[PDB]
């Protein structure tokens, strides 16, 4: 897409109709004449364009209206309304931009932000750019959250997010021109290798991949066409549905074999009846011949009954001699149809133990992408976010993805080694209580008009609580926290002194000997300048490999690598990092997933602010004071960095609408 239309696409907006959000800010336009709606849409799309074509400077309202031309630059209130809506909700002037207008000397309202992961950071920058006093409370000794980057010497490798999922509609695209990230494209060529150590041949690889993709569409058919979404009063999972598809393919293989040999019997028996006829007929021909021989033994001249006896037996014998010939014409056909049928037997199996092991790798890849065993994914909804996928290639960050959060943190009041232990929210304001992570002795108190919680969903999920809410969160929010899934996914960074792999493949696989270990060290990445391989632990393996020591784990990695490349081309690694995200108490996992029995509606529940009851009974309903953001709160882009970042952008708009007023809705 190109033009002002491409600006809307790159902002996840339809160019030709107004969104639900815009209907709420511009209800005059939307209920208005079809022409007015259209004028607005151009003004929006053009302002988006101006921001996107240069996101290293602020886009001022004045600067906006200069570059508009009539009839659009005639109504100045509409342009000022549209600009202020875009500015407020993080569609323009978000990220790391240079301020034409330096920001007010004195601020308004105080906001505490729990967590300095990307969602926290992105809100904090917005709020501070709106004139608010913002402070972030961060349990770790570093910003980034689940954007972790390992650095030692010239060695650089992400323990957290490492992939940008494509710049088409992606806000990280704006952040890419803003911060210098060496963004390097990912070659999708992935050569598999079995536990023996040798490559899977192309023929097999294409078979199994296409069976995998076919098995997936099969589950979708089951889901949306047969309403097979509850079994035994419990919601069906993806893994459940895959087994049921596979069993039915295995069943239909057996069904085909039975109907094949059932044709071979149906003809072996037509043959049996045919040969019993050619015995009982050859025995009549053996008898008639005798009788004709005797009758021709009566020496002429004969009387006429004896001559009739010869002529008659001769007729009768050539007649049975003809039935026997038609019965061996027919016999011949039946002996052929039995080399026909037993030369074309249907398929012997559905998948051999070898083919199921390569299929298990493609299932590990899927368990990796959703950071959870397929037995936990909701069959109905696990892919409810595929329609908002970004266009383009997937990319890595060659300098390490920590450079983004580190860059957002520039200019912000961040308290590190500050763990929130209690959040107190009442009608008059809020107080957050945090300890120091080093000596849990030193206690802190933070008074504010609003708290923005970006606590990871695994932290919210923790029992007994790591963080107490006062008053407790309502059932509708705690039940969303229980229903949602928080998965798990770990990395092994392998630091070598020489490249010994194919430098032209970014990634290559290793097939597990068994289903249960399908995710155990199943995939490798060569993403970086330096000699670093990076190794994934997905699925049920992820949670188990956290009770295994580094050296045992780095061992199984070298074994697998020796098998692929030969026992002498693999040096002992110089540096070795193993992540344990389920153990990390500021994470309790890697990211969220659409659990069976959950749905994307829970992701909106996670986003709704909390409003405390009145202090004085009979006092007017107060303002909301507790706000939520982070990857588990954005329905259309869960479990990603761009999704966190957007969730921070929106709460900042929401909080400012609440505490600075939204002048643009008149």
């Amino acid at each position: 897409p190109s033009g002002v239309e491409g600006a809307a696409f790159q902002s996840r907006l339809p160019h030709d109709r107004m969104t639900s959000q815009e209907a709420a800010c511009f209800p005059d336009i939307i209920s208005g004449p079809q022409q007015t709606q259209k004028v607005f849409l151009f003004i929006r799309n053009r302002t988006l364009q101006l921001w996107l074509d240069n996101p290293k400077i602020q886009l001022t309202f004045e600067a906006t209206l200069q570059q508009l031309e009539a009839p659009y630059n005639s109504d100045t209130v509409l342009v000022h309304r549209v600009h202020s809506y875009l500015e407020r909700h993080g569609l323009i002037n978000f990220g790391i931009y240079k301020r034409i207008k330096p920001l007010p000397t004195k601020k308004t309202g105080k906001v505490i932000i729990i967590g300095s992961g990307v969602s926290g950071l992105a809100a904090a920058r917005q709020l501070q750019s709106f004139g608010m006093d913002v402070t972030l409370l961060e349990a770790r000794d570093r910003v980034g959250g689940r954007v972790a980057t390992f650095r030692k010497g010239n060695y650089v490798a992400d323990l957290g997010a490492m992939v940008v999922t494509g710049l088409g509609g992606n806000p990280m695209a704006v952040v890419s021109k803003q911060v210098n990230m060496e963004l390097a494209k990912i070659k999708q060529k992935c050569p598999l290798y079995e536990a023996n150590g040798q490559a899977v041949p192309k023929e097999k690889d294409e078979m199994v991949e296409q069976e995998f993709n076919r098995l997936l569409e099969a589950t979708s058919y089951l889901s949306h066409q047969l309403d097979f979404n509850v079994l035994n009063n419990k919601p069906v999972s993806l893994g459940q549905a895959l087994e049921v598809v596979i069993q039915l393919q295995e069943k239909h293989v057996k069904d085909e074999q039975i109907e094949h040999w059932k044709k071979i019997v149906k003809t072996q028996e037509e043959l049996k009846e045919l040969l019993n006829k050619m015995v009982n007929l050859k025995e009549k021909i053996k008898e008639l011949h005798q009788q004709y021989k005797e009758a021709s033994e009566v020496k002429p001249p004969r009387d006429i009954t004896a001559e009739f006896l010869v002529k008659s037996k001769h007729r009768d014998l050539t007649a049975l001699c003809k039935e026997y010939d038609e019965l061996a014409e027919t016999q011949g056909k039946l002996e052929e149809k039995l080399q026909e049928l037993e030369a074309n037997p249907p398929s012997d199996v559905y998948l051999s133990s070898r083919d199921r092991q390569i299929l298990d790798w493609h299932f590990a890849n899927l368990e990796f992408a959703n950071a959870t065993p397929l037995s936990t994914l909701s069959l109905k909804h696990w892919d409810q976010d595929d329609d908002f996928e970004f266009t383009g290639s997937h990319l890595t960050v060659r300098n390490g993805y920590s450079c983004v959060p580190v860059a957002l943190a520039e200019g912000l009041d961040i308290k590190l080694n500050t763990a929130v232990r209690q959040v107190r929210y009442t009608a008059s304001g809020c107080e957050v209580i945090a300890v120091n992570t080093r000596s849990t002795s030193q206690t802190f108190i933070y008074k504010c008009d609003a708290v923005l919680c970006t606590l990871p969903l695994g932290v919210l999920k923790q029992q007994p609580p790591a963080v107490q809410f006062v008053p407790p969160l309502p059932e509708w929010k705690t039940s969303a926290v229980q229903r949602m899934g928080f998965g798990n996914l770990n990395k092994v960074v392998l630091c070598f002194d020489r490249v010994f792999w194919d430098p032209s493949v970014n990634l290559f696989g290793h097939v597990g000997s068994t289903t249960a270990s399908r995710g155990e060290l199943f995939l490798f990445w060569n993403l970086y300048k330096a000699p670093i391989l990076l190794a994934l632990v997905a699925g049920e393996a992820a949670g188990i490999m956290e009770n295994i020591s580094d050296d045992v784990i780095v061992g199984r990695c070298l074994a697998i690598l020796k098998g692929i490349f030969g026992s002498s081309a693999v040096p002992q690694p110089k540096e070795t990092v193993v992540s344990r995200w389920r153990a990390d108490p500021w994470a309790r996992g890697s990211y969220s997933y659409v659990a069976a029995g959950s749905s994307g509606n829970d992701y909106d529940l996670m986003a709704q602010p909390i409003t405390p009851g009145p202090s004085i009974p009979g006092a007017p309903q107060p303002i909301p004071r507790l706000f939520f953001a982070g990857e588990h709160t954005i329905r259309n882009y869960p479990a990603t960095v761009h999704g966190a970042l957007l969730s921070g952008l929106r709460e900042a708009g929401r909080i400012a609408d609440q505490f600075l007023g939204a002048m643009y809705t008149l």
Binding site: R214, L215, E217, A218, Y221, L222, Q225, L226, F228, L231, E243, V244, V245, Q247, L248, Q249, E250, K251, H252, K254, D255, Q257, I258, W261, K262, I264, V265, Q268, E269, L271, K272, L275, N276, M278, V279, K282, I285, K286, H289, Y292, I304, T305, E307, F308, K311, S312, H314, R315, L317, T318, A319, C321, Y324, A328
Partner: protein, 133 residues
């Protein structure tokens, strides 16, 4: 609206493999064993039918008779007449057989015969008498 091609997936199928926690394995065995069942029933009749093939060694070749290539005449020797009355007694109305016995008469003059010589050779009581068999 329809499954991927090759995939097999019917509403009746899914329930049967979902009925309990072993239904899938149970159903896959009813067919492993239905397959053995047919498979050695195969080698049974395959081996009965190999017996019948031996009993037919040599076919029927010591038993064939050469071909009477005989031009078809039109007159009725008294010999040919008496052969006819006996074939009527043995074959009822199968005119092909009767024309094959007499050899030199075609199937039409056999019909012709049934009429011209009907009174004199008394063909009606003959046919009556053949139906009694």
């Amino acid at each position: 609206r329809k499954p991927p091609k090759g995939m097999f997936l019917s509403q009746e199928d899914v329930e049967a493999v979902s009925a309990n926690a072993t239904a899938a394995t149970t159903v896959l065995r009813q067919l492993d064993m239905e397959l053995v069942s047919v498979k050695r029933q195969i080698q049974n009749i395959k081996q009965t039918n190999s017996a019948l093939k031996e009993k037919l060694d040599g076919g029927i070749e010591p038993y064939r008779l050469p071909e009477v290539i005989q031009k078809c005449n039109a007159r009725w020797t008294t010999e040919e007449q008496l052969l006819a009355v006996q074939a009527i007694r043995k074959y009822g109305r199968d005119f092909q057989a009767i024309s094959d016995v007499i050899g030199n008469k075609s199937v039409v003059q056999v019909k012709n015969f049934f009429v011209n010589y009907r009174r004199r050779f008394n063909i009606d009581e003959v046919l009556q008498e053949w139906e009694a068999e």
